[PDB]
Amino acid sequence: SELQRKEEEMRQMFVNKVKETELELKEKERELHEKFEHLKRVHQEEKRKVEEKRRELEEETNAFNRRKAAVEAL
Amino acid sequence: SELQRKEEEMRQMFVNKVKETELELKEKERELHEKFEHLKRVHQEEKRKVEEKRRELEEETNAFNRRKAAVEAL
């Protein structure tokens, strides 16, 4: 009767609240994927930055070795 | 002569400074690897946390569907 009417809209009111929360976690589940692919790019960028500074220093020792070799050849 | 003595210790003083900086970048290059493997674990942990909350909600809808089905069977 009228008791089953209220026992239907309430039984769906909880479902509608779970379906909404179930969907937000799904959206946050792809949001942490985007935030993780971002840090993978920042990591790969910061790595290449340091990897070329060591190449920018490997050539400074060579330049100093050529300055030393150019003098010892006299 | 004495000019080449100072032109030797100075030529090595710059090298010793580059070799020190070249090594720090190498140590920081593995430090960003450890800091990146850490966030990969935090990401994989936070993912599994959300992935089971949606399984903790998928069973709440089933429990409510069984409560609804148990009444309609009367």
PDB file of C-alpha atoms in Angstrom:
ATOM      1  CA  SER A   1       0.000   0.000   0.000  1.00  0.00           C
ATOM      2  CA  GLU A   2       1.211   3.486   0.891  1.00  0.00           C
ATOM      3  CA  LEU A   3       3.990   1.900   2.961  1.00  0.00           C
ATOM      4  CA  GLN A   4       5.415   0.260  -0.174  1.00  0.00           C
ATOM      5  CA  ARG A   5       5.241   3.593  -2.008  1.00  0.00           C
ATOM      6  CA  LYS A   6       7.624   5.194   0.490  1.00  0.00           C
ATOM      7  CA  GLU A   7       9.622   1.951   0.560  1.00  0.00           C
ATOM      8  CA  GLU A   8      10.187   2.364  -3.186  1.00  0.00           C
ATOM      9  CA  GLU A   9      11.206   6.018  -3.536  1.00  0.00           C
ATOM     10  CA  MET A  10      13.546   5.621  -0.563  1.00  0.00           C
ATOM     11  CA  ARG A  11      15.026   2.391  -1.937  1.00  0.00           C
ATOM     12  CA  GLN A  12      15.794   4.339  -5.125  1.00  0.00           C
ATOM     13  CA  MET A  13      16.947   7.454  -3.247  1.00  0.00           C
ATOM     14  CA  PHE A  14      19.861   5.483  -1.796  1.00  0.00           C
ATOM     15  CA  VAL A  15      20.660   3.925  -5.184  1.00  0.00           C
ATOM     16  CA  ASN A  16      20.701   7.344  -6.851  1.00  0.00           C
ATOM     17  CA  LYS A  17      23.154   8.488  -4.167  1.00  0.00           C
ATOM     18  CA  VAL A  18      25.395   5.449  -4.706  1.00  0.00           C
ATOM     19  CA  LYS A  19      25.307   5.749  -8.503  1.00  0.00           C
ATOM     20  CA  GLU A  20      26.404   9.382  -8.151  1.00  0.00           C
ATOM     21  CA  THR A  21      29.304   8.501  -5.843  1.00  0.00           C
ATOM     22  CA  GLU A  22      30.198   5.469  -7.972  1.00  0.00           C
ATOM     23  CA  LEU A  23      30.527   7.818 -10.953  1.00  0.00           C
ATOM     24  CA  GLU A  24      32.646  10.430  -9.156  1.00  0.00           C
ATOM     25  CA  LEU A  25      35.201   7.777  -8.191  1.00  0.00           C
ATOM     26  CA  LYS A  26      35.268   6.742 -11.856  1.00  0.00           C
ATOM     27  CA  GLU A  27      35.950  10.349 -12.877  1.00  0.00           C
ATOM     28  CA  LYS A  28      38.589  10.721 -10.160  1.00  0.00           C
ATOM     29  CA  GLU A  29      40.071   7.414 -11.346  1.00  0.00           C
ATOM     30  CA  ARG A  30      40.836   8.961 -14.735  1.00  0.00           C
ATOM     31  CA  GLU A  31      41.826  12.239 -13.057  1.00  0.00           C
ATOM     32  CA  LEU A  32      44.685  10.528 -11.220  1.00  0.00           C
ATOM     33  CA  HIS A  33      45.722   9.006 -14.557  1.00  0.00           C
ATOM     34  CA  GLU A  34      46.021  12.459 -16.139  1.00  0.00           C
ATOM     35  CA  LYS A  35      47.851  13.746 -13.057  1.00  0.00           C
ATOM     36  CA  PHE A  36      50.220  10.763 -13.273  1.00  0.00           C
ATOM     37  CA  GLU A  37      50.920  11.075 -17.004  1.00  0.00           C
ATOM     38  CA  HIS A  38      51.726  14.723 -16.255  1.00  0.00           C
ATOM     39  CA  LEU A  39      54.405  13.874 -13.688  1.00  0.00           C
ATOM     40  CA  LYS A  40      55.845  11.269 -16.066  1.00  0.00           C
ATOM     41  CA  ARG A  41      56.389  14.113 -18.538  1.00  0.00           C
ATOM     42  CA  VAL A  42      57.853  16.442 -15.902  1.00  0.00           C
ATOM     43  CA  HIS A  43      60.152  13.614 -14.799  1.00  0.00           C
ATOM     44  CA  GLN A  44      61.257  12.875 -18.366  1.00  0.00           C
ATOM     45  CA  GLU A  45      61.759  16.613 -18.918  1.00  0.00           C
ATOM     46  CA  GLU A  46      63.792  17.170 -15.745  1.00  0.00           C
ATOM     47  CA  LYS A  47      65.849  14.082 -16.600  1.00  0.00           C
ATOM     48  CA  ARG A  48      66.768  15.366 -20.064  1.00  0.00           C
ATOM     49  CA  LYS A  49      67.634  18.701 -18.436  1.00  0.00           C
ATOM     50  CA  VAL A  50      70.204  17.109 -16.118  1.00  0.00           C
ATOM     51  CA  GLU A  51      71.383  14.689 -18.816  1.00  0.00           C
ATOM     52  CA  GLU A  52      72.443  17.620 -21.019  1.00  0.00           C
ATOM     53  CA  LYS A  53      74.040  19.629 -18.206  1.00  0.00           C
ATOM     54  CA  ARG A  54      76.462  16.728 -17.754  1.00  0.00           C
ATOM     55  CA  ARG A  55      77.073  16.894 -21.502  1.00  0.00           C
ATOM     56  CA  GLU A  56      77.504  20.664 -21.098  1.00  0.00           C
ATOM     57  CA  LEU A  57      80.195  19.895 -18.494  1.00  0.00           C
ATOM     58  CA  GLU A  58      81.794  16.972 -20.349  1.00  0.00           C
ATOM     59  CA  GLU A  59      82.725  19.446 -23.100  1.00  0.00           C
ATOM     60  CA  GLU A  60      84.162  21.980 -20.634  1.00  0.00           C
ATOM     61  CA  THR A  61      86.730  19.443 -19.429  1.00  0.00           C
ATOM     62  CA  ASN A  62      87.558  18.645 -23.059  1.00  0.00           C
ATOM     63  CA  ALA A  63      87.954  22.353 -23.836  1.00  0.00           C
ATOM     64  CA  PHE A  64      90.273  22.716 -20.839  1.00  0.00           C
ATOM     65  CA  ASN A  65      92.181  19.597 -21.922  1.00  0.00           C
ATOM     66  CA  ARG A  66      92.653  21.134 -25.376  1.00  0.00           C
ATOM     67  CA  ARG A  67      93.872  24.371 -23.784  1.00  0.00           C
ATOM     68  CA  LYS A  68      96.344  22.307 -21.760  1.00  0.00           C
ATOM     69  CA  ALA A  69      97.350  20.194 -24.768  1.00  0.00           C
ATOM     70  CA  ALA A  70      97.817  23.261 -26.980  1.00  0.00           C
ATOM     71  CA  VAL A  71     100.371  24.659 -24.508  1.00  0.00           C
ATOM     72  CA  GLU A  72     102.298  21.418 -23.946  1.00  0.00           C
ATOM     73  CA  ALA A  73     102.771  21.116 -27.724  1.00  0.00           C
ATOM     74  CA  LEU A  74     105.086  24.156 -27.608  1.00  0.00           C
TER      75      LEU A  74
ATOM     76  CA  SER B   1     108.806  28.291 -15.607  1.00  0.00           C
ATOM     77  CA  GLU B   2     106.924  29.557 -12.563  1.00  0.00           C
ATOM     78  CA  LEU B   3     104.189  30.833 -14.890  1.00  0.00           C
ATOM     79  CA  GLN B   4     103.498  27.271 -16.064  1.00  0.00           C
ATOM     80  CA  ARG B   5     103.368  26.094 -12.443  1.00  0.00           C
ATOM     81  CA  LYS B   6     100.433  28.401 -11.706  1.00  0.00           C
ATOM     82  CA  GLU B   7      99.009  27.578 -15.143  1.00  0.00           C
ATOM     83  CA  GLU B   8      98.902  23.919 -14.084  1.00  0.00           C
ATOM     84  CA  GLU B   9      97.351  24.041 -10.608  1.00  0.00           C
ATOM     85  CA  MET B  10      94.723  26.471 -11.897  1.00  0.00           C
ATOM     86  CA  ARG B  11      94.001  24.334 -14.967  1.00  0.00           C
ATOM     87  CA  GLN B  12      93.366  21.448 -12.556  1.00  0.00           C
ATOM     88  CA  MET B  13      91.466  23.618 -10.058  1.00  0.00           C
ATOM     89  CA  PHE B  14      88.748  24.204 -12.655  1.00  0.00           C
ATOM     90  CA  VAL B  15      88.691  20.514 -13.613  1.00  0.00           C
ATOM     91  CA  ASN B  16      88.313  19.479  -9.972  1.00  0.00           C
ATOM     92  CA  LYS B  17      85.360  21.875  -9.724  1.00  0.00           C
ATOM     93  CA  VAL B  18      83.748  20.457 -12.877  1.00  0.00           C
ATOM     94  CA  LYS B  19      84.306  16.836 -11.829  1.00  0.00           C
ATOM     95  CA  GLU B  20      82.584  17.623  -8.522  1.00  0.00           C
ATOM     96  CA  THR B  21      79.581  19.232 -10.227  1.00  0.00           C
ATOM     97  CA  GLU B  22      79.502  16.493 -12.876  1.00  0.00           C
ATOM     98  CA  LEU B  23      79.201  13.949 -10.056  1.00  0.00           C
ATOM     99  CA  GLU B  24      76.453  15.795  -8.163  1.00  0.00           C
ATOM    100  CA  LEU B  25      74.264  15.850 -11.279  1.00  0.00           C
ATOM    101  CA  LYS B  26      74.872  12.102 -11.574  1.00  0.00           C
ATOM    102  CA  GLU B  27      73.750  11.620  -7.966  1.00  0.00           C
ATOM    103  CA  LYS B  28      70.737  13.886  -8.499  1.00  0.00           C
ATOM    104  CA  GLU B  29      70.001  11.917 -11.681  1.00  0.00           C
ATOM    105  CA  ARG B  30      69.462   8.768  -9.619  1.00  0.00           C
ATOM    106  CA  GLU B  31      67.723  10.798  -6.900  1.00  0.00           C
ATOM    107  CA  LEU B  32      64.962  11.813  -9.315  1.00  0.00           C
ATOM    108  CA  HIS B  33      64.659   8.138 -10.280  1.00  0.00           C
ATOM    109  CA  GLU B  34      64.012   7.149  -6.659  1.00  0.00           C
ATOM    110  CA  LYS B  35      61.589  10.060  -6.264  1.00  0.00           C
ATOM    111  CA  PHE B  36      59.799   8.943  -9.443  1.00  0.00           C
ATOM    112  CA  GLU B  37      59.575   5.259  -8.504  1.00  0.00           C
ATOM    113  CA  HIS B  38      58.081   6.482  -5.220  1.00  0.00           C
ATOM    114  CA  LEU B  39      55.254   8.385  -6.915  1.00  0.00           C
ATOM    115  CA  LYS B  40      54.605   5.387  -9.176  1.00  0.00           C
ATOM    116  CA  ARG B  41      53.942   3.388  -6.004  1.00  0.00           C
ATOM    117  CA  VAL B  42      51.765   6.107  -4.460  1.00  0.00           C
ATOM    118  CA  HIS B  43      49.837   6.309  -7.738  1.00  0.00           C
ATOM    119  CA  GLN B  44      49.369   2.535  -7.907  1.00  0.00           C
ATOM    120  CA  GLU B  45      48.336   2.561  -4.239  1.00  0.00           C
ATOM    121  CA  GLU B  46      45.822   5.401  -4.599  1.00  0.00           C
ATOM    122  CA  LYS B  47      44.442   3.697  -7.712  1.00  0.00           C
ATOM    123  CA  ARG B  48      43.807   0.403  -5.912  1.00  0.00           C
ATOM    124  CA  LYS B  49      42.186   2.417  -3.111  1.00  0.00           C
ATOM    125  CA  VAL B  50      39.622   3.966  -5.464  1.00  0.00           C
ATOM    126  CA  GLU B  51      39.242   0.733  -7.447  1.00  0.00           C
ATOM    127  CA  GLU B  52      38.023  -1.075  -4.315  1.00  0.00           C
ATOM    128  CA  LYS B  53      35.744   1.739  -3.134  1.00  0.00           C
ATOM    129  CA  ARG B  54      33.797   1.276  -6.372  1.00  0.00           C
ATOM    130  CA  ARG B  55      33.688  -2.436  -5.560  1.00  0.00           C
ATOM    131  CA  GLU B  56      32.586  -1.465  -2.038  1.00  0.00           C
ATOM    132  CA  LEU B  57      29.729   0.485  -3.664  1.00  0.00           C
ATOM    133  CA  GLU B  58      28.906  -2.085  -6.358  1.00  0.00           C
ATOM    134  CA  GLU B  59      27.964  -4.484  -3.544  1.00  0.00           C
ATOM    135  CA  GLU B  60      25.803  -1.890  -1.764  1.00  0.00           C
ATOM    136  CA  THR B  61      23.550  -1.583  -4.816  1.00  0.00           C
ATOM    137  CA  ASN B  62      23.371  -5.382  -4.992  1.00  0.00           C
ATOM    138  CA  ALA B  63      22.477  -5.562  -1.294  1.00  0.00           C
ATOM    139  CA  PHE B  64      19.741  -2.974  -1.848  1.00  0.00           C
ATOM    140  CA  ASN B  65      18.543  -4.880  -4.925  1.00  0.00           C
ATOM    141  CA  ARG B  66      18.301  -8.046  -2.821  1.00  0.00           C
ATOM    142  CA  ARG B  67      16.357  -6.144  -0.157  1.00  0.00           C
ATOM    143  CA  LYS B  68      14.006  -4.944  -2.897  1.00  0.00           C
ATOM    144  CA  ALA B  69      13.787  -8.396  -4.496  1.00  0.00           C
ATOM    145  CA  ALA B  70      13.125 -10.092  -1.150  1.00  0.00           C
ATOM    146  CA  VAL B  71      10.061  -7.874  -0.627  1.00  0.00           C
ATOM    147  CA  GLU B  72       8.639  -8.206  -4.148  1.00  0.00           C
ATOM    148  CA  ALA B  73       8.745 -12.006  -3.766  1.00  0.00           C
ATOM    149  CA  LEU B  74       5.965 -11.751  -1.154  1.00  0.00           C
TER     150      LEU B  74
END
